[PDB]
Symmetry: C2
Subunit: 579 residues, 2 copies
């Protein structure tokens, strides 16, 4: 168990630059004492001064009350909340209740990370409980929310909902694969309907979870970025400079598109050449593209880094906007690097494959090739993601009075922050595969289903021992990923349909695209209406009712003719008798 330490700061000190390092250390200690936190300094690995900080319960209660009042202010209104508030006290500047010791912004640049400590007793029991069960109840997600915050809990709830909704497409994918034959239009229609239903039901469940956890409306709260650089104050940044920096994305995206397209064109030409030249034993004919998938986590990886670089010079005032831009860039890059091969096979090679002939001349049309390539692009990338996610850290860790706890912290600070964006991106890519390309290989979703059951555990293990405890954040929604899902639905309703007409055989293709797109729109409207006509809303209404119950001259002669009661009745009766 931990030693009561609530937060941990690294503050590594190099061999040189010690003269200002000591000043930074004393400034950090003075600020941490001023804000009202108890501090304890110990030695660490590689010449570092590891400082543990905890809480004067009166000041902590005052901070809790101030935060609750602020949450009530915007209409928004446990270990996760306590850790989040301690992190806010550590991070927020002196202007609004804190002592800003953020690494990148101020002169306190000798700190590397401020992170909480993992609870091994909770972690092992959580892993055992999640591995010994078949399904996960809402109580498990609630425990995740209480311990690791709302972002991790929201990701795990989304993963559970996705895994539970993946049964239906698995079921009728197996039905279509066993009976309906290859490239069934009915399967495409059912896949589009399931995508619409899952997206809308996840929106409803997201609203319900936000109401239940009391995090409804946190997205409207704007949080300033400590590393944001401004020029004037009236903190403002000229939007022209930001637009100029953003315009650099377009040539970057075009260059990435050209490079990836050329690489996939060469790989597809090579695989066609070996399939049409060599006899093999059948399986070696897809050897190139398989390698391509094995190369996918590498190149895209460095590409992701470039995206981060593109988000560094692209200044953003708020955390939400910066996160949304980073998610957009990462989603575009991963969409490219994960679907360009399938798009080229389905909509370039299949319709008019008479353009690759020069490339086949450099080395020296089966419609069922798309099904095999989808099978490979379903099974192999999942295996390689498993390898790079769970077992390669297994090998990495296998290679490697109070000494036990100190050693545990020293080994803990070497790990990386848990990036939930990567897991969100992987799940969104899987959903996209199901939505737009599962028609070629109907069993694909089934395989994904199995992987999801592993992921819900494996990703949990990734937060158990493969990564250090993340900062507990609050999120109303899963964020811009929702939009991505919608996109991967809509274009999917096109793409799958465009597969069915193309691999089963000009006007018919366009007619099929029209019918599929309009069917997708119609079922979207119908499901939205059905869900609007169908717990969180009832609780909000009950709270509103409880608050409501707890909250409490001709003119001057015209009106003097019959001022009384009997006078009016008598005149009315008399004139009734008159008429």
């Amino acid at each position: 168990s931990n030693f009561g330490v609530d937060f941990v700061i690294h503050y590594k000190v190099p061999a040189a630059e010690r003269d200002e390092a000591e000043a930074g250390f004393v400034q950090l200690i003075r600020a941490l004492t001023t804000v009202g936190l108890a501090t304890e300094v110990r030695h660490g690995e590689n010449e570092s001064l590891l400082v543990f900080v905890k809480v004067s319960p009166d000041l902590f209660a005052k901070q809790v009350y101030r935060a609750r009042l602020g949450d009530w202010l915007h209409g928004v209104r446990v270990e996760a909340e306590r850790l989040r508030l301690i992190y806010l006290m550590i991070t927020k500047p002196h202007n609004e209740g804190g002592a800003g010791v953020t690494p990148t912004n101020a002169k306190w640049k000798h700190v590397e990370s401020i992170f909480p400590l993992h609870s091994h007793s909770f972690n092992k029991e959580w892993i055992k409980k999640w591995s010994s069960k078949y399904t996960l109840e809402q109580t498990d997600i609630d425990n995740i929310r209480d311990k690791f915050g709302e972002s991790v809990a929201f990701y795990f709830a989304f993963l559970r909902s996705y895994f539970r909704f993946l049964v239906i497409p698995s079921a009728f994918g197996f039905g279509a694969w066993l009976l309906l034959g290859q490239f069934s239009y009915l399967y495409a229609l059912l896949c589009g309907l399931w995508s619409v239903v899952f997206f809308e039901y996840w929106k409803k469940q997201e609203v319900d979870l936000a109401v239940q956890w009391g995090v409804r409306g946190v997205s409207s709260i704007q949080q300033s970025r400590p590393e944001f650089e401004w020029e004037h104050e009236a903190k403002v940044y000229p939007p022209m400079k930001r637009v100029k920096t953003q315009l650099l994305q377009i040539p970057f995206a075009l260059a990435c598109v050209v490079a990836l397209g050329a690489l996939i064109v060469t790989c597809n030409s090579l695989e066609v050449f070996i399939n049409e030249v060599y006899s093999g034993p059948q399986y070696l004919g897809f050897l190139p593209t398989i390698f391509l998938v094995i190369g996918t986590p590498t190149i895209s990886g460095v590409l992701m880094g470039a995206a981060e670089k593109l988000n560094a010079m692209e200044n953003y005032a708020t955390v939400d906007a910066h996160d949304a831009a980073l998610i957009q860039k990462q989603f575009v890059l991963n969409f490219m690097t994960s679907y360009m091969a399938l798009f080229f096979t389905a909509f370039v090679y299949i319709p008019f494959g008479h353009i690759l002939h020069p490339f086949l001349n450099f080395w020296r049309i089966n419609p069922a090739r798309i099904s095999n390539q989808m099978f490979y692009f379903t099974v192999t990338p999942q295996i390689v993601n498993f390898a790079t996610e769970v077992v390669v850290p297994y090998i990495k860790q296998q290679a490697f009075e109070e000494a036990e706890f100190l050693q545990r912290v020293r080994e803990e600070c070497t790990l990386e922050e848990y990036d939930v964006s990567g897991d969100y991106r992987e799940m969104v890519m899987q959903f996209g595969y199901v939505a737009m390309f599962s028609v070629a290989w109907p069993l694909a979703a089934c395989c994904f289903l199995v992987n999801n059951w592993v992921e819900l555990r494996s990703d949990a293990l990734k937060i158990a021992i493969s990564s250090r405890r993340p900062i507990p954040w609050r999120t109303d929604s899963i964020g811009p990923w929702l939009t991505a899902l919608s996109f991967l639905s809509w274009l999917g309703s096109i793409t799958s349909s465009a597969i069915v007409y193309l691999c089963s055989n000009a006007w018919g293709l366009l007619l099929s695209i029209l019918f599929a797109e309009h069917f997708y729109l119609v079922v979207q409207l119908a499901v939205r209406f059905v869900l609007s006509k169908l717990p969180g809303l009832q609780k909000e209404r009950k709270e509103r009712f409880q608050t409501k119950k707890r909250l409490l001259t001709p003119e001057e002669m015209f009106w003097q003719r019959q001022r009384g009661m009997q006078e009016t009745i008598e005149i009315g009766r008399r004139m009734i008798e008159q008429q």
Copy 2:
């Protein structure tokens, strides 16, 4: 002017069955004085007794405070508000703050109309001011809101905004008519872009006006219908009966489709026959359809009545749901009667006109014909609409009231429906005749006055009803914009000449969606929100063992500093 009269009670008494009429009048007067309104009985017209009711200012102030507290409760928070509150006190049941004398629910069914009085001095000045102007500033709409309530004000604001936005339609319609010949794809794209821009900008204006008038969120308040009929109480109506009654709309819609389609088919066949037989001097070639247009306000009118009858037996708990259902049925019927003739001309006769030959033989291909039809479906339906709207000691005050109660209650749904139909014409069929928008501009300038006159002297003063937006008409506008995006490209391809039609439809619809997303993003990136944020900020400002031995090694701060320095020297 008025005699301080705030509301007028009709209570017509029939000569036959009078024994229960005196008791009803006595109960009416007793309840109306129980709620706290001064009443004055006077003679009516044709065996009726009109009683004028006004306001004990203390009770009116208490009611005002209660209404404001209720508005604050739901998050929502002048003569119109006073009249609305007096209406609520007159209408609301005695169980919850009022004395229910609603005409249709209880046995007090002898009252017919529940209406206030017009101010002639205000009405003539308003008409003179609006007739002598060229453009209307926001002060006129604010005065309309202060006088006739928020529904009429919202309608007039929508009419003014849509008339102002129609100027670009007319501009590039004239540009295309002069230069781009006939059936220009560029005009179709511009019309779709304008439809999207106008729809989104009117939504933004709706939000700004709801914030400005303090009616932001009124639509969230569910108001119960006095005419609602319930079986049990837990007032609950079995939804299965409502669904069974709603299912009667499908056969009615199908029968109306069949009848109107047969009428359009036979009129089209007759006009084709006379164009291919009669020589003339011409203009008579579209004589049949013109008559159909002249026949449109009649038959559709009775259809509208059927619709409301279909909404009477279709019991609705809330006012909003009943109004939405009525708007949906009326919009469907008017869409049919006003667009299915052009739909037959464009997408049935033009593509394959070989199926109308049996009708021509019973009586016994031009690709520019549709444009001519678009002319006769633009200048004729509005002109006849004009003929529908405006062409066809205390004795003076009492006579004025007696003449006032003979008028009909002013409905805003009809004017909303007419404007929505005109917008649908522009969005879907204006490509055939690009000048149509120009005409729809001029009529608009008349309508903004003419409709005002319809409320000035041709109808009784409407009950001031607060509304958040224009209602379900936004859905109609969006549907018309999307259908126009499809139909403009379809007409362009079909009249400028099988695979290319679908490609053009795809390109136009996807361009419509892309510009919809772009305009939504631009408007989200770009008055009332600033005021709401400032109010929120103002409210924010106004609102306010080894375990123990581990932390005992360095209890203070100077000791921690010394220990840190010592460990620094140790590295």
